[PDB]
Amino acid sequence: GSHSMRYFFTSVSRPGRGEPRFIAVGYVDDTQFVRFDSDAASQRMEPRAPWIEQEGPEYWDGETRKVKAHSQTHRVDLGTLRGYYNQSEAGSHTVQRMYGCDVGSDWRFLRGYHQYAYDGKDYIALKEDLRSWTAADMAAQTTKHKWEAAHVAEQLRAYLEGTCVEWLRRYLENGKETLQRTDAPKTHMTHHAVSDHEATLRCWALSFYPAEITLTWQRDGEDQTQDTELVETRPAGDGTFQKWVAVVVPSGQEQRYTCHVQHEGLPKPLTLRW
């Protein structure tokens, strides 16, 4: 299927003393592969996936040069936004940025992104066609006009449709053991009595990759949501993910209930019966 490369940048001002905390992480799909932290000792972009370790020193010097340039930019941007929003120098404020690209199964550019939030709210974002901007408010209209006047979209597009996908292609090849492997969920169902007259069925999906998954209960062939409980999908810590969904049913009636699992690593959905 498709694959995505994503970069997430967070910059938080520290008005008590010093410059903003800046954290940048790079992802291919649900796998982190690089990180930069302004409060870490290296002051370098660092490897977070074995397959990125194959890149030599020129890559790391390049990535470090750029990531630090990004840091300064966010630093300047926080200053800029505090001004736009007439905020005092005394509050702590946050800038968040995300950009990246997807390739389809044909390995070609499919989609690109570039979006910006201030203090946890939409600020400005590049539209799907990568030619124009979505400005959330009047402050953002300033950014929109400046960026349109300086043809930033075009430059961004050239990256997202070009060099962005070239890197993604390269990473997918070099890390093919893991990046292009799908780990189908290991599923089982547990049963516990909660009374003399009803029981809890819990259907588990463990150790799957990627994170995207659908778990649903059926009763006599129909979706059931009443009397169900679930958890949001969670990282297992070893690079895989976990989820369960539970239902409470009259003791003796378990045969009615089926758990349904959909995941990219499964040719067909799974059905589990007690």
């Binding site: 970069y7 890559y59 990535e63 750029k66 941007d77 961004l156 990256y159 060099t163 962005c164």
Partner: peptide, 9 residues
């Protein structure tokens, strides 16, 4: 790899 551009707000 990162984008070399990053324009300022």
């Amino acid at each position: 790899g990162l984008c070399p551009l990053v324009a300022m707000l």
